[PDB]
Amino acid sequence: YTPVEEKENGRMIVIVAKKYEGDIKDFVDWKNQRGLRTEVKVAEDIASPVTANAIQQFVKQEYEKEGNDLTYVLLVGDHKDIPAKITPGIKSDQVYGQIVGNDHYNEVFIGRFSCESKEDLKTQIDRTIHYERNITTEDKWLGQALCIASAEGGPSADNGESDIQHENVIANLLTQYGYTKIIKCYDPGVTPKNIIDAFNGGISLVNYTGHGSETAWGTSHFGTTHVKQLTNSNQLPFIFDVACVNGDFLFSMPCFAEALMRAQKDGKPTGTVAIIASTIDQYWAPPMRGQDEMNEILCEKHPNNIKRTFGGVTMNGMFAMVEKYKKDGENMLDTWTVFGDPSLLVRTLVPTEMQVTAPANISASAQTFEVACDYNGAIATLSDDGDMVGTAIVKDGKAIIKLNESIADETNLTLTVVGYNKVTVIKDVKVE
Ligand SMILES: *CC(=O)[C@H](CCCNC(=N)N)NC(=O)[C@H](Cc1ccccc1)NC(=O)[C@H](N)Cc1ccccc1
Ligand SMILES: [Ca+2]
Ligand SMILES: [Ca+2]
Ligand SMILES: [Ca+2]
Ligand SMILES: [Ca+2]
Ligand SMILES: [Ca+2]
Ligand SMILES: [Ca+2]
Ligand SMILES: [Zn+2]
Ligand SMILES: [Zn+2]
């Protein structure tokens, strides 16, 4: 299949319901600070009442603009705030990113921060910023994974694997890549305690393959009522969830996925940093292929298809499903919904540090700024209070940042450098 790229110069639009307009600033500032051009659009400004047709039209319109650099779209609100596209048998956010080619292969990654209160939003913003900005060499819970499998399935499943055999292949792939601990919770016998203990012990990735209801997992019986028992404060995994309706966010109560994204303990984020879960019932075999490819891409098994964002990893993993299962695969892709930031830079192992050498000062008339970094591929960005002044990728040991405006009016600039499985570096640059 042809992958959908995380365009180096891509941008993001956060479509936020009016009642949350004044609460998203810190998120928008951080994204611009690390080099992802991000703009905000108030949903009611697109149309009031807000409808699925208007959102769809707005995204298409923005995508068509000269360059087609639109790459991510984050929806901020629950279904009542920003609706999902609803057609017979389909509830979907993913469809908003299907713009070209009369097909179901997205052009744009879509994600959602489902919130019904200000704190639901604040906790999703904070956990995301902490994950990309504040993870250090001491966050030892990274590189540890949890595989969960029902005792069902067989020869007629994807690649003829029962859910257990399917998860074992995934566990081997993760181990080969470098994960240091794989926890296996396979039926029969899994209880809520087993899941609660795993999360509380520290894990950065969860793969689930089995049955599910709107509010719980069939294997373990762990559900929304058990979320309050989690104490994995800012030690959050992301999840590839194969199950029926765990992601039905139009349910009368918070669904499984929403509960995990909104969980908090004494003001700190618990639960998950991101999860992809279905709004409808899932077929047995198709999602298995998608889940496998997501893990293959995460473990960099395809050198010319590297994806660093949660949206990029999951969407490209689903392309393989569509390719092999066709129509059935397309229905699964449309409804397998991303909860969390689609631009999220995933972490797989305990990070290492980067050696960054940059001038302590910059001329008020400078057009460029050179930074030395011992990690090629890092993204170096200069910003001013959430305003991105220039960004560049490290190549051959250095990044040559071209300023997009005059800094003659500034006294200080913030240099931010991020890198895959690296500790984020933030330095000040005095303007002389
Ligand atoms: C509801 C679930 O949680 C279950 C999730 C399966 C995930 N894949 C793996 N664990 N490997 N889904 C089902 O059990 C599925 C639900 C469904 C019902 C009606 C239409 C479409 C999906 N049911 C089945 O797979 C059964 N084999 C019945 C069936 C449905 C569709 C075609 C053929 C058989
Ligand atoms: Ca397309
Ligand atoms: Ca509260
Ligand atoms: Ca498999
Ligand atoms: Ca049960
Ligand atoms: Ca909801
Ligand atoms: Ca593959
Ligand atoms: Zn923090
Ligand atoms: Zn079954």
Tab-separated table of C-alpha atoms and ligand atoms in Angstrom:
chain	number	residue	atom	x	y	z
A	1	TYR	CA	0.000	0.000	0.000
A	2	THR	CA	1.079	3.635	-0.407
A	3	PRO	CA	1.719	5.241	3.017
A	4	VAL	CA	0.309	8.580	4.114
A	5	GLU	CA	3.216	10.799	5.132
A	6	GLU	CA	3.866	12.877	8.229
A	7	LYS	CA	4.870	15.883	6.098
A	8	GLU	CA	7.956	17.554	7.524
A	9	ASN	CA	6.354	20.959	6.967
A	10	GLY	CA	2.853	19.768	7.813
A	11	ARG	CA	0.517	21.787	10.013
A	12	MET	CA	-2.273	21.057	12.454
A	13	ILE	CA	-5.631	22.641	13.025
A	14	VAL	CA	-7.322	22.278	16.390
A	15	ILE	CA	-11.115	22.564	15.926
A	16	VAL	CA	-12.376	23.473	19.364
A	17	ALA	CA	-15.900	23.935	20.668
A	18	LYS	CA	-16.443	27.531	21.744
A	19	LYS	CA	-16.814	26.719	25.436
A	20	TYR	CA	-13.222	25.409	25.475
A	21	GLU	CA	-11.720	28.159	23.309
A	22	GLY	CA	-9.958	29.847	26.199
A	23	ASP	CA	-8.547	26.636	27.644
A	24	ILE	CA	-6.421	25.272	24.780
A	25	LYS	CA	-3.685	27.935	24.651
A	26	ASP	CA	-0.977	25.965	26.467
A	27	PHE	CA	-1.444	23.059	24.054
A	28	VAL	CA	-1.260	25.222	20.946
A	29	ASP	CA	1.816	27.027	22.311
A	30	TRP	CA	3.686	23.786	23.001
A	31	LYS	CA	3.004	22.371	19.539
A	32	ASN	CA	4.300	25.528	17.903
A	33	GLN	CA	7.210	25.525	20.348
A	34	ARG	CA	8.366	22.083	19.209
A	35	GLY	CA	7.994	22.826	15.527
A	36	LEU	CA	4.471	21.794	14.525
A	37	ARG	CA	2.685	24.812	13.044
A	38	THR	CA	-0.671	24.795	14.798
A	39	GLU	CA	-3.731	26.993	14.302
A	40	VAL	CA	-7.079	27.109	16.082
A	41	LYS	CA	-10.579	27.176	14.596
A	42	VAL	CA	-13.660	27.614	16.778
A	43	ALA	CA	-16.247	25.050	15.658
A	44	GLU	CA	-19.208	27.427	15.977
A	45	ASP	CA	-17.334	29.801	13.675
A	46	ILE	CA	-17.532	27.142	10.964
A	47	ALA	CA	-21.280	26.781	11.409
A	48	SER	CA	-23.859	27.028	14.151
A	49	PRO	CA	-25.280	24.624	15.038
A	50	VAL	CA	-22.114	22.657	14.279
A	51	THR	CA	-22.791	19.801	11.887
A	52	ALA	CA	-20.735	16.918	10.536
A	53	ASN	CA	-21.179	18.237	6.988
A	54	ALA	CA	-19.711	21.611	7.945
A	55	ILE	CA	-16.656	20.076	9.655
A	56	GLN	CA	-16.039	17.807	6.666
A	57	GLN	CA	-16.320	20.762	4.278
A	58	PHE	CA	-14.024	22.915	6.431
A	59	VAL	CA	-11.273	20.272	6.511
A	60	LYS	CA	-11.487	19.677	2.759
A	61	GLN	CA	-11.299	23.433	2.165
A	62	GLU	CA	-8.217	23.825	4.397
A	63	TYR	CA	-6.546	20.788	2.820
A	64	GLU	CA	-6.982	22.193	-0.682
A	65	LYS	CA	-5.169	25.418	0.143
A	66	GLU	CA	-1.976	26.014	-1.845
A	67	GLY	CA	0.500	23.318	-0.756
A	68	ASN	CA	-1.876	20.780	0.821
A	69	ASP	CA	0.294	20.893	3.945
A	70	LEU	CA	-2.627	20.206	6.310
A	71	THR	CA	-1.594	17.007	8.088
A	72	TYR	CA	-3.344	16.756	11.464
A	73	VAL	CA	-6.727	17.759	12.830
A	74	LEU	CA	-7.618	17.609	16.503
A	75	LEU	CA	-11.265	17.783	17.570
A	76	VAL	CA	-11.848	19.162	21.068
A	77	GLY	CA	-15.244	18.238	22.561
A	78	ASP	CA	-17.517	15.182	23.033
A	79	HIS	CA	-20.137	14.234	20.329
A	80	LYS	CA	-22.571	16.888	21.498
A	81	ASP	CA	-19.881	19.605	21.036
A	82	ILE	CA	-18.393	18.485	17.725
A	83	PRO	CA	-20.382	15.704	16.080
A	84	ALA	CA	-19.013	12.587	14.429
A	85	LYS	CA	-20.137	11.768	10.884
A	86	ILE	CA	-23.109	9.402	11.169
A	87	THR	CA	-24.424	7.210	8.351
A	88	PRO	CA	-26.246	3.858	8.641
A	89	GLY	CA	-24.001	1.513	10.599
A	90	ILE	CA	-21.105	3.990	10.784
A	91	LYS	CA	-20.040	6.521	13.448
A	92	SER	CA	-16.850	8.242	12.347
A	93	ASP	CA	-14.248	10.961	12.926
A	94	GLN	CA	-11.702	9.294	10.577
A	95	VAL	CA	-13.859	10.148	7.549
A	96	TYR	CA	-13.057	13.842	8.013
A	97	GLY	CA	-9.545	13.081	6.732
A	98	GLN	CA	-10.655	11.162	3.604
A	99	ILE	CA	-10.481	13.867	0.970
A	100	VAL	CA	-8.874	12.647	-2.261
A	101	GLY	CA	-9.011	9.586	-4.481
A	102	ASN	CA	-12.562	8.362	-3.848
A	103	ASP	CA	-11.295	5.879	-1.294
A	104	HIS	CA	-10.928	5.313	2.431
A	105	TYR	CA	-7.195	5.986	2.605
A	106	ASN	CA	-6.906	9.137	4.726
A	107	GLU	CA	-4.952	12.173	3.554
A	108	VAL	CA	-5.177	13.709	7.036
A	109	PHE	CA	-4.733	12.196	10.521
A	110	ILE	CA	-7.713	12.783	12.832
A	111	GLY	CA	-7.834	12.584	16.622
A	112	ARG	CA	-10.138	13.774	19.416
A	113	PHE	CA	-9.909	15.055	22.986
A	114	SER	CA	-13.380	13.982	24.164
A	115	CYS	CA	-14.390	16.254	27.064
A	116	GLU	CA	-17.580	17.044	28.943
A	117	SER	CA	-15.891	19.356	31.492
A	118	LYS	CA	-12.911	21.733	31.710
A	119	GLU	CA	-10.870	19.309	33.745
A	120	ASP	CA	-11.395	16.534	31.169
A	121	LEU	CA	-9.694	18.824	28.669
A	122	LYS	CA	-7.018	20.101	31.003
A	123	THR	CA	-5.902	16.563	31.881
A	124	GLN	CA	-5.626	15.505	28.208
A	125	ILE	CA	-3.596	18.595	27.415
A	126	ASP	CA	-1.303	18.168	30.421
A	127	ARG	CA	-0.618	14.485	29.875
A	128	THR	CA	0.253	15.178	26.232
A	129	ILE	CA	2.642	18.032	26.941
A	130	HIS	CA	4.304	16.118	29.786
A	131	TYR	CA	4.822	13.104	27.486
A	132	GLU	CA	6.534	15.061	24.719
A	133	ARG	CA	8.305	17.643	26.882
A	134	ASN	CA	9.041	16.221	30.317
A	135	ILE	CA	10.005	12.521	30.008
A	136	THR	CA	13.536	11.842	31.338
A	137	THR	CA	16.071	8.994	31.635
A	138	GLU	CA	14.419	8.192	34.953
A	139	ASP	CA	11.059	7.209	33.435
A	140	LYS	CA	11.894	3.506	33.663
A	141	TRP	CA	8.346	2.332	32.919
A	142	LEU	CA	9.016	2.880	29.202
A	143	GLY	CA	10.052	-0.122	27.140
A	144	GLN	CA	7.588	-2.331	29.039
A	145	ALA	CA	4.505	-3.733	27.377
A	146	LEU	CA	1.252	-5.534	28.176
A	147	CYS	CA	-0.313	-8.033	25.742
A	148	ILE	CA	-3.902	-9.135	26.456
A	149	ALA	CA	-5.691	-11.948	24.594
A	150	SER	CA	-9.005	-13.816	24.731
A	151	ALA	CA	-8.829	-17.641	24.630
A	152	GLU	CA	-10.674	-17.576	21.313
A	153	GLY	CA	-10.075	-17.531	17.581
A	154	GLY	CA	-8.416	-19.985	15.246
A	155	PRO	CA	-7.527	-21.187	11.693
A	156	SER	CA	-10.120	-18.888	10.132
A	157	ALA	CA	-8.681	-15.737	11.764
A	158	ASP	CA	-6.036	-13.444	10.257
A	159	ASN	CA	-3.016	-15.593	9.346
A	160	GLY	CA	-4.866	-18.457	11.011
A	161	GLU	CA	-3.970	-17.272	14.524
A	162	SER	CA	-6.022	-17.549	17.709
A	163	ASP	CA	-5.884	-14.288	19.713
A	164	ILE	CA	-3.178	-15.782	21.940
A	165	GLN	CA	-0.957	-16.858	19.008
A	166	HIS	CA	-1.520	-13.425	17.464
A	167	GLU	CA	-0.416	-11.632	20.615
A	168	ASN	CA	2.590	-13.958	21.027
A	169	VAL	CA	3.874	-12.925	17.588
A	170	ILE	CA	3.485	-9.307	18.688
A	171	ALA	CA	5.326	-9.965	21.957
A	172	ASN	CA	8.286	-11.489	20.042
A	173	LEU	CA	8.397	-8.456	17.726
A	174	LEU	CA	8.443	-6.066	20.700
A	175	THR	CA	11.177	-8.083	22.419
A	176	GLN	CA	13.322	-8.112	19.263
A	177	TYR	CA	12.946	-4.333	19.019
A	178	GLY	CA	14.159	-3.748	22.554
A	179	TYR	CA	11.237	-3.815	24.991
A	180	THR	CA	12.693	-5.149	28.260
A	181	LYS	CA	9.525	-6.592	29.774
A	182	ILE	CA	6.402	-8.078	28.205
A	183	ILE	CA	3.490	-8.836	30.517
A	184	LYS	CA	1.066	-11.463	29.212
A	185	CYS	CA	-2.513	-11.571	30.462
A	186	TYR	CA	-4.157	-14.341	28.483
A	187	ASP	CA	-7.493	-15.963	29.298
A	188	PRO	CA	-8.764	-18.040	30.969
A	189	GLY	CA	-8.620	-16.447	34.409
A	190	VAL	CA	-7.725	-12.811	33.837
A	191	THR	CA	-9.339	-10.521	36.417
A	192	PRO	CA	-9.565	-6.711	36.873
A	193	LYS	CA	-6.769	-6.910	39.461
A	194	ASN	CA	-4.341	-8.280	36.852
A	195	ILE	CA	-4.909	-5.255	34.644
A	196	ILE	CA	-4.877	-2.717	37.460
A	197	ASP	CA	-1.574	-4.162	38.754
A	198	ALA	CA	0.011	-4.041	35.288
A	199	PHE	CA	-0.871	-0.377	34.737
A	200	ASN	CA	0.222	0.571	38.258
A	201	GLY	CA	3.509	-1.243	37.817
A	202	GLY	CA	4.447	0.814	34.763
A	203	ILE	CA	3.894	0.102	31.052
A	204	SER	CA	4.163	2.207	27.886
A	205	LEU	CA	2.260	0.049	25.368
A	206	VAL	CA	-0.863	-2.120	25.530
A	207	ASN	CA	-2.111	-4.466	22.827
A	208	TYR	CA	-5.551	-5.981	23.419
A	209	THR	CA	-7.194	-8.576	21.173
A	210	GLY	CA	-10.550	-9.989	22.240
A	211	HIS	CA	-14.127	-9.013	23.077
A	212	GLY	CA	-15.416	-5.745	24.406
A	213	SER	CA	-18.522	-3.790	25.333
A	214	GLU	CA	-19.011	-0.018	25.414
A	215	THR	CA	-17.458	0.134	28.864
A	216	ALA	CA	-15.171	-2.860	29.347
A	217	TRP	CA	-12.846	-5.569	28.108
A	218	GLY	CA	-14.270	-9.107	27.835
A	219	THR	CA	-10.909	-10.551	28.852
A	220	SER	CA	-10.154	-9.353	32.426
A	221	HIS	CA	-13.604	-7.796	32.765
A	222	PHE	CA	-11.694	-4.547	33.500
A	223	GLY	CA	-13.965	-1.563	32.810
A	224	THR	CA	-14.828	2.088	33.400
A	225	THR	CA	-15.669	1.392	37.028
A	226	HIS	CA	-12.100	0.160	37.669
A	227	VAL	CA	-10.354	3.175	36.160
A	228	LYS	CA	-10.542	5.033	39.497
A	229	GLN	CA	-8.146	2.428	40.889
A	230	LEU	CA	-5.287	3.406	38.553
A	231	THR	CA	-2.381	5.324	40.033
A	232	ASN	CA	0.002	5.344	37.061
A	233	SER	CA	0.613	9.099	37.462
A	234	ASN	CA	2.132	10.343	34.206
A	235	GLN	CA	3.348	6.801	33.414
A	236	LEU	CA	0.907	6.421	30.510
A	237	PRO	CA	0.800	3.787	27.770
A	238	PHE	CA	-0.945	4.163	24.416
A	239	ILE	CA	-3.209	1.336	23.283
A	240	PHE	CA	-4.011	-0.533	20.036
A	241	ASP	CA	-7.464	-1.881	20.926
A	242	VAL	CA	-9.099	-4.719	18.976
A	243	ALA	CA	-12.629	-5.112	20.347
A	244	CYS	CA	-16.239	-4.159	19.685
A	245	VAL	CA	-17.470	-0.713	20.686
A	246	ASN	CA	-14.774	0.198	23.273
A	247	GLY	CA	-14.690	3.512	21.417
A	248	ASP	CA	-18.403	4.297	21.107
A	249	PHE	CA	-18.210	7.849	22.362
A	250	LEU	CA	-21.842	8.496	21.510
A	251	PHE	CA	-22.862	6.046	24.287
A	252	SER	CA	-25.113	7.325	27.138
A	253	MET	CA	-22.164	7.063	29.559
A	254	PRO	CA	-18.436	7.607	29.003
A	255	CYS	CA	-17.128	4.685	26.926
A	256	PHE	CA	-14.046	2.595	27.800
A	257	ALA	CA	-11.736	4.835	25.716
A	258	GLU	CA	-13.072	8.134	27.089
A	259	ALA	CA	-12.731	6.971	30.715
A	260	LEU	CA	-9.059	6.118	30.190
A	261	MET	CA	-8.255	9.451	28.506
A	262	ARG	CA	-10.018	11.445	31.279
A	263	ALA	CA	-8.705	9.552	34.319
A	264	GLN	CA	-7.004	11.638	37.027
A	265	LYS	CA	-5.689	10.988	40.536
A	266	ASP	CA	-5.159	13.940	42.865
A	267	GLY	CA	-4.774	16.311	39.922
A	268	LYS	CA	-2.353	14.095	37.966
A	269	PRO	CA	-3.087	12.194	34.689
A	270	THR	CA	-3.613	8.433	34.993
A	271	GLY	CA	-4.873	5.931	32.442
A	272	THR	CA	-3.706	6.366	28.839
A	273	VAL	CA	-1.910	8.988	26.739
A	274	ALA	CA	-3.733	7.734	23.598
A	275	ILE	CA	-5.903	4.862	22.407
A	276	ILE	CA	-7.477	3.810	19.110
A	277	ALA	CA	-10.844	2.103	19.717
A	278	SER	CA	-13.889	1.246	17.583
A	279	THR	CA	-17.203	3.065	17.659
A	280	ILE	CA	-19.001	-0.022	16.318
A	281	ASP	CA	-18.821	-3.805	16.428
A	282	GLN	CA	-15.612	-5.121	14.866
A	283	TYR	CA	-15.268	-8.109	12.563
A	284	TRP	CA	-13.020	-10.881	13.850
A	285	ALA	CA	-10.049	-11.042	11.441
A	286	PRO	CA	-9.622	-7.634	9.717
A	287	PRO	CA	-8.610	-5.638	12.831
A	288	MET	CA	-6.006	-8.294	13.591
A	289	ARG	CA	-4.111	-7.392	10.398
A	290	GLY	CA	-4.336	-3.712	11.293
A	291	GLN	CA	-3.017	-4.308	14.804
A	292	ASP	CA	-0.093	-6.322	13.450
A	293	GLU	CA	0.966	-3.627	11.019
A	294	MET	CA	0.711	-0.930	13.707
A	295	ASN	CA	3.245	-2.860	15.772
A	296	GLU	CA	5.476	-3.577	12.747
A	297	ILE	CA	5.607	0.134	11.950
A	298	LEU	CA	6.168	1.018	15.634
A	299	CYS	CA	9.131	-1.365	15.676
A	300	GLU	CA	10.588	0.199	12.543
A	301	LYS	CA	10.357	-3.000	10.528
A	302	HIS	CA	9.766	-1.115	7.273
A	303	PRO	CA	12.723	1.250	6.688
A	304	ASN	CA	10.947	3.332	4.086
A	305	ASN	CA	7.756	3.653	6.158
A	306	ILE	CA	8.862	5.203	9.437
A	307	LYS	CA	6.112	6.945	11.410
A	308	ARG	CA	6.734	8.908	14.599
A	309	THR	CA	3.196	10.044	15.499
A	310	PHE	CA	0.329	8.060	17.019
A	311	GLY	CA	-1.806	9.088	14.060
A	312	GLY	CA	0.815	8.057	11.512
A	313	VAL	CA	1.449	4.692	13.128
A	314	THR	CA	-2.198	3.725	13.488
A	315	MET	CA	-3.518	5.004	10.145
A	316	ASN	CA	-0.756	3.327	8.126
A	317	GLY	CA	-1.275	0.143	10.099
A	318	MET	CA	-4.939	0.258	9.073
A	319	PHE	CA	-4.059	0.738	5.368
A	320	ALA	CA	-2.693	-2.815	5.389
A	321	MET	CA	-6.050	-3.977	6.725
A	322	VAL	CA	-7.990	-2.245	3.935
A	323	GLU	CA	-5.619	-3.653	1.332
A	324	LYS	CA	-6.172	-7.230	2.498
A	325	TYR	CA	-9.828	-7.120	3.575
A	326	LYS	CA	-11.336	-4.534	1.192
A	327	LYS	CA	-14.916	-3.417	2.037
A	328	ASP	CA	-14.893	-5.080	5.484
A	329	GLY	CA	-11.519	-3.468	6.074
A	330	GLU	CA	-12.830	-0.025	5.077
A	331	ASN	CA	-15.717	-0.164	7.555
A	332	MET	CA	-13.216	-1.012	10.289
A	333	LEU	CA	-10.869	1.831	9.347
A	334	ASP	CA	-13.667	4.443	9.284
A	335	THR	CA	-14.762	3.527	12.800
A	336	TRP	CA	-11.433	2.725	14.496
A	337	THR	CA	-11.189	6.079	16.267
A	338	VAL	CA	-8.221	7.923	17.653
A	339	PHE	CA	-8.746	9.328	21.160
A	340	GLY	CA	-5.862	11.615	22.011
A	341	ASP	CA	-3.481	13.838	20.021
A	342	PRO	CA	-2.977	12.478	16.469
A	343	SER	CA	0.362	14.308	16.278
A	344	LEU	CA	1.634	12.675	19.464
A	345	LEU	CA	5.328	11.688	19.145
A	346	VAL	CA	5.315	8.148	20.538
A	347	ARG	CA	7.994	6.807	22.884
A	348	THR	CA	8.905	3.115	22.917
A	349	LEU	CA	11.993	2.844	25.152
A	350	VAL	CA	13.618	4.680	28.057
A	351	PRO	CA	15.105	7.756	26.349
A	352	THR	CA	18.744	8.732	26.035
A	353	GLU	CA	20.019	12.304	26.130
A	354	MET	CA	21.183	14.471	23.250
A	355	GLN	CA	24.274	16.646	23.061
A	356	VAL	CA	23.092	20.054	21.861
A	357	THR	CA	25.526	22.909	21.332
A	358	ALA	CA	24.131	26.299	20.349
A	359	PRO	CA	25.203	29.959	20.677
A	360	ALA	CA	24.062	31.617	23.888
A	361	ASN	CA	23.118	34.724	21.910
A	362	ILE	CA	21.632	35.638	18.546
A	363	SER	CA	21.902	38.870	16.583
A	364	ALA	CA	18.742	40.992	16.501
A	365	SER	CA	19.297	41.142	12.729
A	366	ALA	CA	20.018	37.449	12.200
A	367	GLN	CA	18.314	35.558	9.383
A	368	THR	CA	19.597	32.156	10.434
A	369	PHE	CA	20.681	30.279	13.524
A	370	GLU	CA	22.922	27.209	13.578
A	371	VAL	CA	22.621	24.468	16.183
A	372	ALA	CA	24.913	21.469	16.656
A	373	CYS	CA	23.288	18.188	17.720
A	374	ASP	CA	24.766	14.696	18.035
A	375	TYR	CA	21.461	13.114	16.952
A	376	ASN	CA	20.521	13.362	13.284
A	377	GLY	CA	16.783	13.604	12.772
A	378	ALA	CA	16.117	15.802	15.790
A	379	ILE	CA	13.818	18.758	15.262
A	380	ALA	CA	15.232	22.110	16.406
A	381	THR	CA	12.843	25.037	16.795
A	382	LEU	CA	13.034	28.675	17.814
A	383	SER	CA	9.968	30.293	19.322
A	384	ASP	CA	8.701	33.277	21.229
A	385	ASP	CA	5.844	32.695	23.681
A	386	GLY	CA	4.090	30.140	21.465
A	387	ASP	CA	5.085	31.907	18.278
A	388	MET	CA	7.312	29.733	16.064
A	389	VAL	CA	10.077	31.748	14.446
A	390	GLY	CA	11.835	28.949	12.613
A	391	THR	CA	12.359	25.212	12.611
A	392	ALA	CA	14.687	22.710	10.989
A	393	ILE	CA	15.760	19.081	11.076
A	394	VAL	CA	19.248	18.090	12.211
A	395	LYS	CA	21.372	16.702	9.369
A	396	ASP	CA	25.085	15.906	9.400
A	397	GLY	CA	25.309	17.056	12.993
A	398	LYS	CA	23.582	20.387	12.540
A	399	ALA	CA	20.355	22.284	12.019
A	400	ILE	CA	20.274	25.523	10.062
A	401	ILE	CA	17.167	27.331	11.222
A	402	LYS	CA	15.857	29.995	8.837
A	403	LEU	CA	13.900	32.684	10.694
A	404	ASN	CA	10.469	33.420	9.233
A	405	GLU	CA	10.331	36.947	10.677
A	406	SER	CA	12.389	39.678	12.332
A	407	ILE	CA	13.434	39.167	15.950
A	408	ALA	CA	14.789	42.716	16.268
A	409	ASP	CA	11.903	43.289	18.690
A	410	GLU	CA	12.778	40.370	20.966
A	411	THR	CA	15.012	40.069	24.006
A	412	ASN	CA	14.939	36.265	24.391
A	413	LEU	CA	14.082	33.230	22.281
A	414	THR	CA	13.370	29.654	23.259
A	415	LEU	CA	15.256	26.861	21.534
A	416	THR	CA	13.500	23.481	21.679
A	417	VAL	CA	15.011	20.276	20.363
A	418	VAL	CA	13.066	16.988	20.227
A	419	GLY	CA	14.155	13.585	18.978
A	420	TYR	CA	12.816	10.035	18.780
A	421	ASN	CA	13.287	8.313	22.180
A	422	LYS	CA	15.308	11.335	23.320
A	423	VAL	CA	15.025	13.657	26.274
A	424	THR	CA	13.704	16.998	25.069
A	425	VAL	CA	16.191	19.856	25.299
A	426	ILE	CA	15.052	23.426	25.983
A	427	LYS	CA	17.520	26.349	26.085
A	428	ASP	CA	17.283	30.135	26.153
A	429	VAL	CA	18.779	32.327	23.449
A	430	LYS	CA	19.498	35.922	24.406
A	431	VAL	CA	18.910	38.363	21.553
A	432	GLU	CA	21.792	40.814	21.303
B	1	LIG	C1	-18.038	-7.782	19.795
B	1	LIG	C2	-16.564	-8.121	19.936
B	1	LIG	O1	-15.962	-7.716	20.910
B	1	LIG	C3	-15.833	-9.002	18.900
B	1	LIG	C4	-14.411	-8.415	18.662
B	1	LIG	C5	-13.567	-9.300	17.722
B	1	LIG	C6	-12.153	-8.682	17.570
B	1	LIG	N1	-11.247	-9.533	16.767
B	1	LIG	C7	-10.574	-10.492	17.482
B	1	LIG	N2	-10.719	-10.581	18.783
B	1	LIG	N3	-9.806	-11.306	16.860
B	1	LIG	N4	-16.595	-8.997	17.650
B	1	LIG	C8	-17.440	-10.023	17.310
B	1	LIG	O2	-17.605	-11.000	18.018
B	1	LIG	C9	-18.227	-9.916	16.014
B	1	LIG	C10	-19.221	-8.732	16.209
B	1	LIG	C11	-20.072	-8.463	14.966
B	1	LIG	C12	-21.475	-8.757	14.970
B	1	LIG	C13	-22.263	-8.496	13.812
B	1	LIG	C14	-21.657	-7.940	12.646
B	1	LIG	C15	-20.261	-7.644	12.638
B	1	LIG	C16	-19.471	-7.904	13.795
B	1	LIG	N5	-18.941	-11.200	15.816
B	1	LIG	C17	-18.341	-12.237	15.159
B	1	LIG	O3	-17.211	-12.163	14.693
B	1	LIG	C18	-19.087	-13.558	14.983
B	1	LIG	N6	-18.214	-14.498	14.271
B	1	LIG	C19	-20.430	-13.413	14.172
B	1	LIG	C20	-20.146	-12.910	12.736
B	1	LIG	C21	-20.294	-11.531	12.407
B	1	LIG	C22	-20.017	-11.073	11.089
B	1	LIG	C23	-19.588	-11.992	10.090
B	1	LIG	C24	-19.443	-13.367	10.410
B	1	LIG	C25	-19.719	-13.825	11.724
B	2	CA	CA	-7.711	9.191	0.017
B	3	CA	CA	-13.875	17.076	38.894
B	4	CA	CA	-1.354	-11.652	13.927
B	5	CA	CA	-17.324	-10.148	32.286
B	6	CA	CA	-19.013	10.650	25.099
B	7	CA	CA	4.273	-4.821	7.805
B	8	ZN	ZN	4.757	17.369	33.746
B	9	ZN	ZN	-16.270	-14.890	20.376
